[PDB]
Amino acid sequence: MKELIYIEEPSILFAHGQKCTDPRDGLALFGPLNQIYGIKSGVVGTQKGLQ
Amino acid sequence: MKELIYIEEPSILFAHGQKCTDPRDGLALFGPLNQIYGIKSGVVGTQKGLQ
């Protein structure tokens, strides 16, 4: 029987210096690192695409 | 003894459709038209320049 060693899952920083594993949880809990003030979206498409 | 024609001051629009003659006062009372969410400022210079 061969030994399967374990590599612990690393944690990724988030807002306030906190660390979590899943982005989908670290973002929901604390939020992203740096702050932008907003996204001015530009859309290049048809009218139906814009809708 | 010559006629001097008067030209009425033109109004510059501002936020919420309000028009004022002075750009500064119109900005203060009403504000600009489009709402950019912020200014991600970029600085290119020395340390004292950034300070």
Automatic annotation (TrEMBL), chains A, B:
Q: Which organism is it from?
A: Thermoflavifilum thermophilum
What is the name attached to this protein's record? Piwi domain-containing protein
First-to-last residue of the parent protein present:
1 to 51 of 507
